[PDB]
Swiss-Prot record:
Keywords: ATP-binding, Ligase, Metal-binding, Nucleotide-binding, Zinc. Its cofactor is Zn(2+). This is L-cysteine:1D-myo-inositol 2-amino-2-deoxy-alpha-D-glucopyranoside ligase. Its EC number is 6.3.1.13. Changing residue 252 to A: 1200-fold decfrease in catalytic turnover. Changing residue 228 to F/H: 100-fold decrease in catalytic turnover. A motif ('ERGGDP' region) lies at residues 188-193. The gene is mshC.
Length: 413
């Protein structure tokens, strides 16, 4: 659909380690990721404003690990990401910034492209803009109208189409929150608990009808725009199908977003489980709020690259913590990545070093354990201390360690 970014080289490392075990946010426990021969991943993409902040980075870098660890095990991978190129935050940024919303999003998607290519994240295989996915969303919203799972609000001028929360008996399994806590998040994450004519406070917009002053598209439900959640479950369903191994994104999406996407797809395919694994991750600004230009807490990787930070240092930086930990960027973390990058690059430049077959198996093992990069970086800190301090005799373990750090981690040594 849309052009993504370019793929870095992917060396193949001989051998295999343990199969991936990931934490599933839904079941609140670590279960094995058992994929098919074609392994499938959908990660919620960007809303094209605020370039690539470290929250975006931390997120797509984490699924890079899954992407890469899957490839090393021998799986072929179908990775679909999306762009929310029409969205209410986007319009608010456009109107404040005195710039057109489409011109904004196109330039911001371009900035994301370059930051991902700079960070050596493997591209998705289908890159789908939300505006390029109206037909799929209409075709879906038709099917939930037919099953009564959706309805049209009693508003002839603004005939919004809404999704019944109880359209599905298992609604709430992924998020796990009670109704009181679900309500108060809905209002803080771009939803309408006060919209008149609604059957349930927690029903989610499926098709927002034409408002004056707003872009829109024709449909059997009137003219207007799609809703957020149905966008992603539509693209996910049509490009992959009922057997989705991983659904991932930033942490805010545990609810509403991912809860409702699953609810939509399950209500139309009859499936009980939309995704075998729900995976969430994220960075926060210095203030404990999500990063945004509005808050004055935005750090762009573009600004770090300008500050002269190696893109690999950004990887080691963010990987120094576990992905379900409370990651925070700082000059402290930047220096540990810079020292760690220096230390690793000198060991891999040695003429001969001790055998590495072991430390490769320890790294393959730590990553398969819910992506345990803290313990995987330390095993490499140790193979480096032994090599620099004491030396070895494999004239091949330098290059082998370099190229396995590249394949599995994306770090360029
Ligand atoms: N377009 C939607 C998804 S359909 C969206 O959420 N877009 S986004 O640009 O807000 C975004 C994307 C990826 C990660 C994060 C964050 C992770 C942790 C903190 S923020 C934020
Ligand atoms: Ca659950
Ligand atoms: Zn999404």
């Amino acid at each position: 659909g849309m052009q993504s970014w370019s793929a870095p080289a992917i060396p193949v490392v001989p051998g295999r380690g343990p199969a991936l075990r990931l934490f599933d946010s839904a079941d609140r426990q670590v279960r094995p990721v058992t994929p098919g021969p074609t392994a499938t991943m959908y990660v919620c993409g960007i809303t094209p404003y605020d370039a690539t902040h470290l929250g975006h980075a931390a997120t797509y870098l984490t699924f890079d690990l899954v992407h890469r660890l899957w490839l090393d095990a021998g799986h072929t991978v179908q990775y679909v990401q999306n762009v929310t190129d029409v969205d209410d935050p986007l319009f608010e940024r456009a109107e404040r910034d005195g710039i057109d919303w489409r011109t904004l999003g196109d330039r911001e998607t371009q900035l994301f492209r370059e930051d991902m290519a700079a960070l050596r994240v493997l591209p998705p295989h289908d890159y789908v803009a939300a505006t390029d996915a109206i037909a799929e969303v209409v075709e879906m919203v038709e099917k939930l109208l037919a099953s009564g799972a959706a309805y049209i609000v009693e508003d002839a001028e603004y005939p919004d189409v809404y999704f019944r929360a109880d359209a599905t008996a298992q609604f709430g399994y992924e998020s796990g929150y009670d109704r009181d806590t679900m309500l108060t998040l809905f209002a803080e994450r771009g939803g309408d608990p006060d919209r008149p004519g609604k059957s349930d406070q927690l029903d989610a917009l499926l098709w927002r009808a034409e408002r004056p002053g707003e872009p829109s598209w024709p449909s059997p439900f009137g003219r207007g725009r799609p809703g957020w959640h149905v966008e992603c479950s539509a693209i996910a369903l049509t490009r992959i199908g009922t057997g989705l191994d991983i659904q991932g994104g930033g942490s805010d999406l545990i609810f509403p977003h991912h809860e409702y996407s699953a609810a939509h797809a399950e209500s139309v395919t009859g499936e009980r489980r939309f995704a075998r694994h729900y995976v969430h991750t994220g960075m926060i600004g210095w203030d404990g709020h999500k990063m945004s230009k509005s808050r004055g807490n935005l750090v762009l990787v573009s600004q770090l690259r300008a500050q002269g930070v190696d893109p690999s240092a950004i990887r080691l930086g963010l990987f120094s913590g576990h992905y379900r930990e409370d990651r925070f960027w700082s000059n402290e973390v930047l220096d540990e990545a810079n020292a760690r990058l220096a230390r690793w690059r000198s060991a891999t430049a040695l003429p001969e070093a001790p055998d590495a077959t072991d430390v490769i198996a320890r790294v393959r093992q730590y990553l398969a354990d819910d992506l345990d990069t803290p313990k995987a970086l330390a095993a490499l800190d140790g193979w480096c201390t032994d090599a620099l301090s004491y030396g070895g005799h494999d004239t091949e373990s330098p290059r082998l360690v370099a190229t396995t750090v590249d394949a599995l981690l994306g770090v360029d040594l």
